[PDB]
Amino acid sequence: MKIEEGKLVIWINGDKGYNGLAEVGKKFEKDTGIKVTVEHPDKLEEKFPQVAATGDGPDIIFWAHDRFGGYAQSGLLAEITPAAAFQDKLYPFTWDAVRYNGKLIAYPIAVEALSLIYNKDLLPNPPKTWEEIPALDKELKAKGKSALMFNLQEPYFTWPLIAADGGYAFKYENGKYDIKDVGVDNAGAKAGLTFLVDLIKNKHMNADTDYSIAEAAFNKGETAMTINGPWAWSNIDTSKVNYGVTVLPTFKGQPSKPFVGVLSAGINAASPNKELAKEFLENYLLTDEGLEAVNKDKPLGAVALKSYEEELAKDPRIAATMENAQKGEIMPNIPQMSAFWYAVRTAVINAASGRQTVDAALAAAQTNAAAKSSAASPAALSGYKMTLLALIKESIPNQAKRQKFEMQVGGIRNEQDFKNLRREIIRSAAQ
Ligand SMILES: OC[C@H]1O[C@H](O[C@H]2[C@H](O)[C@@H](O)[C@@H](O)O[C@@H]2CO)[C@H](O)[C@@H](O)[C@@H]1O
C-alpha cells in the first residue's frame, strides 16, 4: 500500500505511550485537519526495515537510536532539517545520538536507562551488589516470594551485567567503532553471563521469564525487585506497590553498565508528508504539552526537551535513571548493531537454558556479531562509490530520492552491492 499523502501514520513500540501520542495526533488534526494514526505493530524494529525497503510504511518511525544507522544506510530515512533555534531547545548529548556520518537522521525524544526497581515493603534497603542477591532470594523464598525477576528474553536487560566487568559491543577508540573487535567473549562478559546463568541454575531466576511474566510478578508483589525502564512505572503506579527506583547493583566491585537508548523519531525517506512530519515532531510533540501527554501515558524517561525536563528531573526516579545512564554508555548507532544484538540475544537464551555452556554461547556470539559479507579492495570500493554518487547527482531529479540513494552508497561493501544499487538508481522513474 502506498503511503497516503495528507495523513501521518506513526509507528511506536507497544511498551511506549502510544495513547498519549495519539492525543498529540488529535491536536495536530484539530489545527491542520490532517489525520494522525498511531500504531504499535509487533516486532517493530524488524517490521519497519522490511516494509520501508519496499518504499512503503509509516511516515514516522520511533525506536531507540541504536537501530537508526542501519535504517539510514538502507535508504529508509530522510535527512531532517531542524533550524538551529529548534536544536537549541534539546540537550546536545541527545542530538549526538541521532547523528550518523556527519548528518542528523532523527529527532531525539527521551533518554532511557534501566534501573533497579524494588518493593519497599518487601525490601526497605535494595542490594548494592549482584553477589548478595542469592542470599536475599533465600530469605524471600522462605516467605513464599522471591528476590528478582526481569526479562531474560531480550539481551538489553542482561547487558548491564555482561558489561559490568568488561564486556563490550565494539571497541571504541579515537571516536570510531572497530566492527572487527567485538567484546562479548572476553573475561568480563564471561563472568557476567556466568553470574546470570548461576542465578538460574541455583533457582533464583527462571530462564523462561519474559517481560510480561516479570512485570506481573513485581506488580502483584510476588518478587521484591525487577529491572526495567521508565515506561514500566505507569503500571507499577496502578498496582499501588510501594516501590523505589535506584542504581543497578555492582558486579565484581564494578558498576553495572546499561546500554542507554535515546527514543528517536525518524521520517521515512519515502514519505510524501515530510513537512507535515517535521511540523508534528517539532511543533506538537517536542513541546511541554506534547511530551506531557505522552509521559502521562507511559513515562518517557529524561526527555530531550530542556523546558520540560527541568520539571521531570526533580523526580528521584529520573535522578536514578540518569545515575544509571552515567555509569553506562549511549549505544552506538552504527549498522552493525543489529548483528550485535542478534548475537547476544542468541547467546543469553542458549546459555540461560542450561543446554549450552557460557563459553560456547559467547564464542559463537563473538563470531556472529562480527559476521559480514565479502569486501571489495579499498581502491575498487572507492571507485564504485564515486561512480554512484556522480550518477545520483546527474540522474535522480527528486531530492529525497537523491538523499536516500547517497546514504545507500555509504553501505556498499563490494561489487555485487555496487551493481544492485546501480540497478535501483537506473530503474528509478518520475516521482
Ligand atoms: O534486547 C535488545 C534490544 O535492546 C534495545 O531495545 C529496548 C528499547 O531500547 C527500549 O525502548 C525498550 O522498549 O525495550 C527494548 C528491549 O526489549 C535496543 O534498542 C534494540 O535495538 C535491541 O534489539
Numbering used by the authors: 0 to 370, 1329 to 1388
How does the study describe this entry?
The paramyxoviral phosphoprotein (P protein) is the non-catalytic subunit of the viral RNA polymerase, and coordinates many of the molecular interactions required for RNA synthesis. Following the coiled-coil, there is a flexible linker that varies widely in length and composition between paramyxoviruses, and then a structured binding domain (the foot domain or X domain) that interacts with both the L protein and the RNA-bound N protein. At the interface between the disordered linker and the structured C-terminal binding domain, a gradual disorder-to-order transition occurs, with X-ray crystallographic analysis revealing a dynamic interfacial structure that wraps the surface of the binding domain.
X-ray diffraction data were collected to ~1.3 Å resolution for crystal form one (space group P21; two molecules in the asymmetric unit) and 1.55 Å resolution for crystal form two (space group P212121; one molecule in the asymmetric unit). In each case, helix α1 of the BD is N-terminally extended beyond Ser339, the previously identified N-terminal residue of the domain. Helix α1 is capped at its N-terminus by Pro335, which orients the preceding residues (329–334) such that they form a clasp or latch that runs across the top of the three-helix bundle. Superimposition of the three molecular models shows that this latch is equivalently positioned in each case with only minor variation in the side-chain hydrogen bonding that mediates formation of the latch. In particular, Arg370 and Asn371, located within the loop connecting helices α2 and α3 of the BD, interact with Ser330 and Ser331 in the latch sequence, through their side chain guanidinium and carboxamide groups.
